[PDB]
């Protein structure tokens, strides 16, 4: 019918009231300073409901911030402009974040950050938080005797109860090669019913109240009245302020399975009715999606795991082994940072650089960018009198969403290392076994020359990533197994912060039916009284993340499932909100409530 009501030569931004809007307004101010384009940030109530209404009239903000789930219904209605970042810009964000903001293939928002719920706990009330939902009733009873509760969280919004509902099988819409079946809905299967029954049981047994909402839970946790809550990264600042000694960790399991929170990509979309689309583009691309821009928002209220690689590298500290194809060497490179705990406190950084080149001239898989997530545990064999290390490691590939035949069983491993650190020569032999099906390494190492002159934990990375578990969907990214049996050369430099460096070269290959890692290490420039040569590192491989809260967010997100963005998501949310609220409050049984939700969603 008519023209836009939105004013030219300025930007009006809507963002939710739980996000860092004062921080974003600081980015606005800098933009205004540089360009003369005034930026107003607003945080209206129920803004995800008000946008489609005002935007259809040709009105509303120039930019709207929300999790990516609602943007497909906006895009279906013609309310969002197709965005046009070029290849160079797109390469600056994780690929998977761009996929969250596609509607019929087209990019319709800029991803900003990847959000998942975690378990937030009070370390003074609960130094070891529960691994299982099932143990929380007894924990509540114990805490109640001391006038505290175990757990309070927002039961009024379905986003917060969904991790429990989905844990044993509930799902929103079924995904089947390419799209969501709008008629195959998982809110009323056995798994959803069991989660929602567990929640209702908590309320019947008086471990939770039906009326707990976002404000009540946050105030209870921040005043030290409940030992746990469930919330997202945006809430961490208010906790910081309260001075409660908190941790953020993996959500509890239910019937043995991880909780499955929905994964939201906070995203910024451009109103189709804005006459300021180029200015909005410049703001989001050249001001907000920069390290300085995300930091201003992040310092206000934490974003989580940001979409922008450069700033996620600064926040996250390169926790995982990050792998890239090195086409020139028909191989790969990798970098990552290990953090070794120092005995009476502190952390000793070890910056790792890596490259692998196949030995044989035969074909190998060159992967897309991805990472390996590694967990290691160190122990001692009480019968072993030589200086030694017992290692158990688990490794899995992630980071996107024939030699392999030599690894389908359990392979014996042998390791030989000749070292020279500041002229101090030493040798290590190891043996054990790898089970690539489970990503599992079990090994024992001995210093064959007497006392190891460096801490054992500093040699863990040097002492067979062919034993990583690459899931089905990622097998084409496994360079390591594809090199075998002839194998590969692996080279590293490892720089120890404020101290020396290791340079390593290894051949990793089958000799007969044994996987053998033969290594030469040279250490130069170390301090004799430093952490390494002075043996000041704790004996473990805890390798804590720079920010354990971000690590816990990504752990929970990988166990979760990306929100669909289909227009039917608004009927989904309404239907589950109603079913959960009803069931909690004793209106109808869990079965009837979830059945009504199913019927409403699929109509
Ligand atoms: O509870 C339903 C609601 O869940 C999600 O909203 C989250 C949002 O993603 C987070 O950024 C944060 O603000 O908490 C909200 C829950 O209160 C969906 O994104 C949203 O569309 C849906 O209605």
Compute, in angstroms, the gap from residue 67 CA to the centroid of ligand 1. Answer: 7
Instruction: State whether 458 and 326 are in the same domain.
Output: yes
> Mind giving me the DSSP string for 31-95?
HHHHHS-EEEEE--TTHHHHHHHHHHTT-S-SEEEEEGGGHHHHHHTT-BPPP---HHHHTTB-H
Instruction: State whether 341 and 447 are in the same domain.
Output: yes
Nearest CA to ligand 1 atom 19: 67
Compute, in angstroms, the gap from residue 25 CA to the centroid of ligand 1. Answer: 22
Atom of ligand 1 nearest to the CA of 48: 21
Which one of 113, 155, 159 would you pick to mutate in the ligand 1 pocket, going by the greatest count of ligand atoms within 8 A of its CB? 159
Compute, in angstroms, the gap from residue 66 CA to the centroid of ligand 1. Answer: 8
Compute, in angstroms, the gap from residue 523 CA to the centroid of ligand 1. Answer: 51
* Matching residue, tokens 């390791």: 415
Atom of ligand 1 nearest to the CA of 70: 21
Instruction: State whether 556 and 588 are in the same domain.
Output: no
Nearest CA to ligand 1 atom 6: 159
Answer yes or no: is the C-beta of 16 below 6 A from any ligand 1 atom: yes
Instruction: State whether 254 and 268 are in the same domain.
Output: no
Contacts of 148 (CB under 8 A, 6+ apart): 125, 224, 225, 226, 227
Instruction: State whether 487 and 423 are in the same domain.
Output: yes
Nearest to 251 by CA among 395, 398, 120, 158: 120
Which one of 21, 67, 101, 115 would you pick to mutate in the ligand 1 pocket, going by the greatest count of ligand atoms within 8 A of its CB? 67
Atom of ligand 1 nearest to the CA of 264: 9
Instruction: State whether 84 and 138 are in the same domain.
Output: no
Instruction: State whether 94 and 121 are in the same domain.
Output: no
CATH number at residue 474: 2.40.155.10
Instruction: State whether 295 and 365 are in the same domain.
Output: no
Q: How many CB atoms lie within 10 A of CB 366?
A: 17
Instruction: State whether 308 and 437 are in the same domain.
Output: no
Instruction: State whether 213 and 273 are in the same domain.
Output: no
Answer yes or no: is the C-beta of 159 below 6 A from any ligand 1 atom: yes
Compute, in angstroms, the gap from residue 457 CA to the centroid of ligand 1. Answer: 42
Q: How many CB atoms lie within 10 A of CB 147?
A: 7
Instruction: State whether 558 and 521 are in the same domain.
Output: no
Answer yes or no: is the C-beta of 163 below 6 A from any ligand 1 atom: no
Report the half-sphere exposure of 37 (CA within 13 A, side-chain side): 23
CATH number at residue 312: 3.40.190.10
Compute, in angstroms, the gap from residue 306 CA to the centroid of ligand 1. Answer: 17
CB-based contact 479:494 (threshold 8 Å): no
Method for structure elucidation:
X-ray
- Find the domain containing 405 and state its range: 319-543
Nearest CA to ligand 1 atom 9: 67
Name the phi and psi angles at 420, rounded to 5.
Answer: -145, 105
Nearest CA to ligand 1 atom 4: 159
Atom of ligand 1 nearest to the CA of 158: 1
Nearest to 180 by CA among 546, 568, 596: 568
* Matching residue, tokens 């300025």: 10
Compute, in angstroms, the gap from residue 268 CA to the centroid of ligand 1. Answer: 15
Q: Are strands 179-186 and 226-231 parallel, antiparallel or unpaired?
A: unpaired
CA gap 481, 466 in Å, rounded: 5
Contacts of 533 (CB under 8 A, 6+ apart): 421, 422, 424, 453, 454, 500, 526, 527
Q: How many helices (H) and strands (E) does the chain have?
A: 17, 26
Answer yes or no: is the C-beta of 74 below 6 A from any ligand 1 atom: no
Atom of ligand 1 nearest to the CA of 18: 13
Instruction: State whether 478 and 575 are in the same domain.
Output: no
Answer yes or no: is the C-beta of 264 below 6 A from any ligand 1 atom: yes
**What is the distance in angstroms between the CA of the first residue and the CA of the last residue of the chain?**
32
Three-state helix/strand/coil letters over 155-193: CCCHHHHHHHHHHCCCEEEEEECCEEEEEEEECCCHHHH
Compute, in angstroms, the gap from residue 329 CA to the centroid of ligand 1. Answer: 46
Nearest CA to ligand 1 atom 3: 159
Chain centroid, CA 155 distance in Å: 24
CA gap 307, 285 in Å, rounded: 12
Nearest CA to ligand 1 atom 16: 159
Kindly give the residue spans of alpha helices, DSSP state H, lying in 317-422. none
Answer yes or no: is the C-beta of 208 below 6 A from any ligand 1 atom: no
Which one of 213, 234, 264 would you pick to mutate in the ligand 1 pocket, going by the greatest count of ligand atoms within 8 A of its CB? 264
CA gap 518, 503 in Å, rounded: 14
Buried b (16+ CB within 10 A) or exposed e, 375-397: ebebeeeeeeeebbbbbebbbbb
Contacts of 598 (CB under 8 A, 6+ apart): 185, 187, 188
Total domains in the chain come to 3
Among 497, 513, 543, the domain boundary falls at: 543
């Amino acid at each position: 019918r008519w023209g836009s009501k939105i004013e030219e030569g300025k930007l009006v931004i809507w963002i939710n009231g739980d996000k860092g809007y004062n921080g974003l307004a600081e980015v606005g101010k800098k933009f205004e300073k540089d360009t003369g384009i005034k930026v107003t940030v607003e945080h209206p109530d129920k803004l995800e409901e008000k946008f489609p209404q005002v935007a259809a009239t040709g009105d509303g903000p120039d930019i709207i911030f929300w999790a990516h789930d609602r943007f497909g219904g906006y895009a279906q209605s013609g309310l969002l402009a197709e965005i046009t970042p070029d290849k160079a810009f797109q390469d600056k964000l994780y690929p998977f974040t761009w996929d969250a903001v596609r509607y019929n293939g087209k990019l319709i928002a800029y991803p900003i950050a990847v959000e998942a719920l975690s378990l937030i706990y009070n370390k003074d009330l609960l130094p070891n938080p529960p691994k299982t939902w099932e143990e929380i009733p007894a924990l509540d009873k114990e805490l109640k005797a001391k006038g505290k509760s175990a757990l309070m969280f927002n039961l009024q919004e379905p986003y917060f109860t969904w991790p429990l509902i989905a844990a044993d099988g509930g799902y929103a819409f079924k995904y089947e090669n390419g799209k969501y079946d709008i008629k195959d809905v998982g809110v009323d299967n056995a798994g959803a019913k069991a989660g929602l029954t567990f929640l209702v049981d908590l309320i019947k047994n008086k471990h939770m109240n039906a009326d707990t909402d976002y404000s009540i839970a946050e105030a209870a946790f921040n005043k030290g009245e409940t030992a746990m809550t469930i919330n997202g990264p945006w809430a961490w600042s208010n906790i910081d302020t309260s001075k409660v000694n908190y941790g953020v960790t993996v959500l509890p399991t239910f019937k043995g399975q991880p909780s499955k929170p929905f994964v939201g990509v906070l995203s910024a979309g451009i109103n189709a009715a804005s006459p300021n689309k180029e200015l909005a583009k410049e703001f989001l691309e050249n001001y907000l999606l920069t390290d300085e821009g995300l930091e201003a928002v992040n310092k206000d209220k934490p974003l989580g795991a940001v979409a922008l690689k450069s700033y996620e590298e600064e926040l996250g500290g390169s926790h995982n082994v990050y792998i890239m194809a090195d086409k020139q060497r028909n191989g790969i490179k990798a970098n990552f940072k290990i953090r070794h705990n120092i005995e009476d406190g502190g952390v000793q950084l070890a910056y790792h650089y890596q490259q692998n080149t196949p030995i044989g001239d035969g074909p190998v898989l060159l992967p897309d960018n991805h990472y390996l997530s590694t967990q290691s545990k160190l122990s001692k064999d009480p019968n072993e009198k030589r200086d030694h290390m017992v290692l158990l490691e688990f490794v899995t590939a992630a980071g996107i969403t024939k030699g392999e035949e030599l690894f389908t069983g359990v392979v014996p491993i042998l390791v030989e290392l000749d070292g020279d650190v500041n002229g101090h020569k030493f040798s290590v032999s190891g043996e054990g076994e790898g089970d690539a099906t489970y990503g599992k390494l079990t090994l024992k190492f001995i210093c064959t020359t007497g006392k190891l002159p460096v801490p054992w934990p500093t040699l863990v990375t040097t002492l067979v990533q062919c034993f990583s578990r690459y899931p089905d969907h990622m097998k084409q990214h496994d360079f390591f197994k594809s090199a075998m049996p002839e194998g590969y050369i692996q080279e590293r430099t490892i720089f120890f912060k404020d101290d020396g460096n290791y340079k390593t070269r290894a051949e990793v290959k089958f000799e007969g039916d044994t996987l053998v890692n033969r290594i030469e290490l040279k250490g130069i420039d170390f301090k004799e009284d430093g952490n390494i040569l002075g043996h000041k590192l704790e004996y473990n491989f805890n390798n804590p993340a720079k920010d354990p809260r971000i690590a816990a967010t990504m752990e929970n997100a990988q166990k979760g499932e990306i929100m669909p963005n289909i227009p039917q998501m608004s009927a989904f949310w309404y239907a589950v909100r109603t079913a959960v609220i009803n069931a909690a409050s004793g209106r109808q049984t869990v079965d009837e409530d979830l059945k009504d939700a199913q019927t409403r969603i699929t109509k």
